[PDB]
Design an enzyme around this catalytic site. Structure first.
Site, short mmCIF file in Angstrom:
data_model
loop_
_atom_site.label_atom_id
_atom_site.label_comp_id
_atom_site.label_asym_id
_atom_site.label_seq_id
_atom_site.Cartn_x
_atom_site.Cartn_y
_atom_site.Cartn_z
N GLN A 23 9.69 -73.31 48.71
CA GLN A 23 11.07 -73.50 48.28
C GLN A 23 11.51 -74.96 48.34
OE1 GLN A 23 13.75 -70.61 50.47
NE2 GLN A 23 14.81 -70.51 48.48
N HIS A 49 13.91 -71.77 53.29
CA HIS A 49 15.23 -71.76 53.91
C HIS A 49 15.71 -73.17 54.26
CE1 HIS A 49 15.44 -67.20 55.08
NE2 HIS A 49 15.09 -67.39 53.82
N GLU A 89 25.68 -62.32 50.51
CA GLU A 89 27.08 -62.40 50.95
C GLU A 89 27.80 -63.59 50.33
OE1 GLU A 89 26.91 -63.25 55.20
OE2 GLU A 89 26.21 -61.20 55.58
N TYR A 109 29.16 -66.77 61.51
CA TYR A 109 29.03 -65.85 60.39
C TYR A 109 27.89 -64.85 60.58
CZ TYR A 109 32.97 -67.96 58.52
OH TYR A 109 34.28 -68.37 58.36
CA LIG Z 1 27.05 -63.17 57.50
#
Ligand SMILES: [Ca+2]
Ligand SMILES: [Ca+2]
Lengths: 342, 321
Positions: A58, A123, A216, A226
């Protein structure tokens, strides 16, 4: 919708951004090249002075973002995966000045580095966005080391807010708190690939991939958690305590079946008045353009566009000409211009 | 939207149909059971006299469809995967009379059989629909033998039109032509799982898992080849379309002139906005429930009725707002 293909042959393009007036727009190719595209002259050769990148998996050259005052300053920010040692890597951000002849990115310097460097390929996050006062927001992935998104002393899974120069704003939420990185705006994120300023509220909005489901959309508040990887709508994941966990914030909106959210642009132009107060997001896995109708901070409808084209939508930007601009993610990647009506 | 979970515990429900004058819903469970559900009494025991089915893979008991004159005839059509004798299966359609006590299907008889039997568990199609003049349309999958869809002498990959009794209309596009199946209406289909009559145009519309990949929605024309003819709307990545219903009720004005389609893989209800024969918008609904949507019907009370495709399958009633 109307679609015009503006350019092809872009190798895994990742970011685009508009220059003022008719100067064109910049595009990153993840292998590690920056290009300029213009209405009349087409695609430029690779612009010199781009940093070396960690082009594994990535990783590579990621976001390209002109400064809010590019017209005066011609400053250009870039995010990219930067190699460490032990074969690992982490995200970095710098800026340079685009030559007046558009041929080289001069004096490029790193102003921020993700630490520690824990990624072996995945990531990185990498999206950038300026808020109304010109603070730089940097969305960081957790580098595939799930628990570190919760660790306050590590820049994994963090939304970061810095000054235009990469310094720590004196009123950032964790400034002067032991064991906490003062760059951090919000934490508990997985791999964010959308970041944009809501033009009506002035709030930064964010979206991120979930693990096999659970993509999300969030409105990240300063100092708040979060959830990742304690709270998730994906699948359960070892550290997960459920879909809702006390002390962690719920998403604004979520998808149980993950479209592969990538890119995000609020539409405010007047060319297509039906599109105003919509949020457009790319879908990589489902190869379509998602359009969310907004009422204030509420998502009231989800619509799909361009699902007949078969292209993984990596980037979405709202053009000053009132059109949407997209990048498709493959080896023969394309720049698309998209309208609503005729 | 509003959702009422009307019934649970349905084992892979496949199809639903309304009986007249609020006498209830007929519901098929893919394993091989026909059930009557009523709002005041819940779910009946399985109705006797259903045919044996080939309940492997996508096969089993599929569509239930009462005759348009059910109130007088009590005739009920079923489509189903019918086992062969060489271990192949094929789609069959039959009808019987629902007994006056709702307990049994009387003299169920097969009126159409896909030949040859080519499926080993996939692509039966199975959807049924009457047009305004009362012909029966039967959507047949290719049985996952792709070339056969194009083969004019095979019933794979065909949309078929028979009379209500299973006769070939003398009007059918291939009657009199040699080596062509006279039952066929259109050909070149892969696996249709949606078949519905447009209430404003009078035309049959169809959707399917499509022969170039992805899913597509068509308006099949008589004698035409669907691959050649090109779709009304195409999804390169298949949502897993299943079920189809046009909304023309009065209860929810915002939904009039919409086409609703279930999504199995993407676990949502798809709403397509229609302007004549063109799709101008696609909305996604019910994604938060995480359910595979197998069946969609417009109810005579102005609500939508859905079946979910799970071991613990549900009957859902859906309204706007
Ligand atoms: Ca979350
Ligand atoms: Ca076709």
């Amino acid at each position: 919708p109307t679609v015009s293909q503006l350019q092809d042959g872009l190798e895994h393009p990742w970011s685009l951004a508009f220059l003022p007036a008719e100067q064109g727009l910049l595009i990153t190719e993840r292998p590690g090249r920056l290009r300029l595209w213009q209405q009349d002259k087409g695609l430029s050769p690779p612009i010199a002075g781009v940093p070396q990148v960690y082009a594994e998996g990535q990783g590579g050259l990621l976001e390209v973002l002109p400064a809010p005052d590019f017209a005066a300053s011609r400053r250009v920010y870039l995010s990219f995966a930067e190699p460490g040692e032990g074969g690992k890597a982490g995200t970095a951000v710098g800026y340079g000045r685009l030559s007046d002849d558009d041929a080289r990115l001069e004096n490029f310097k790193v102003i921020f580095r993700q630490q520690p460097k824990l990624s072996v390929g995945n990531h990185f996050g990498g999206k950038l966005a300026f808020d109304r006062q010109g603070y730089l927001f940097i969305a960081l992935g957790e580098n595939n080391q799930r628990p570190t998104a919760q660790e306050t002393d590590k820049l994994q899974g963090k939304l970061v807010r810095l000054t235009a120069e990469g310094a720590v704003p004196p009123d950032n939420p964790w400034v002067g708190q032991a064991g906490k990185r003062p760059e951090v705006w919000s934490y508990g994120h997985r791999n964010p690939q959308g970041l944009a300023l809501n033009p009506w509220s002035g709030a930064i909005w964010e979206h991120e991939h979930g693990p096999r489901g659970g993509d999300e959309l969030n409105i990240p508040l300063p100092g708040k958690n979060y959830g990742w990887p304690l709270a998730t709508y994906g699948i359960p994941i070892p550290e997960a305590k459920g879909e809702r966990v006390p002390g962690t914030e719920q998403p604004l909106h979520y998808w149980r079946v993950s479209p592969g959210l990538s890119g995000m642009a609020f539409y405010d132009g007047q060319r297509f008045p039906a599109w105003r107060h919509s949020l457009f997001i790319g879908a990589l896995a489902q190869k379509a353009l998602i359009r969310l109708t907004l009422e204030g901070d509420k998502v009231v409808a989800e619509e799909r566009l361009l699902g007949d084209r078969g292209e993984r939508i990596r980037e979405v930007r709202s053009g000053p000409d009132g059109y949407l601009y997209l990048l498709t993610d493959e080896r023969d990647g394309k720049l698309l211009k998209v309208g609503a009506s005729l």
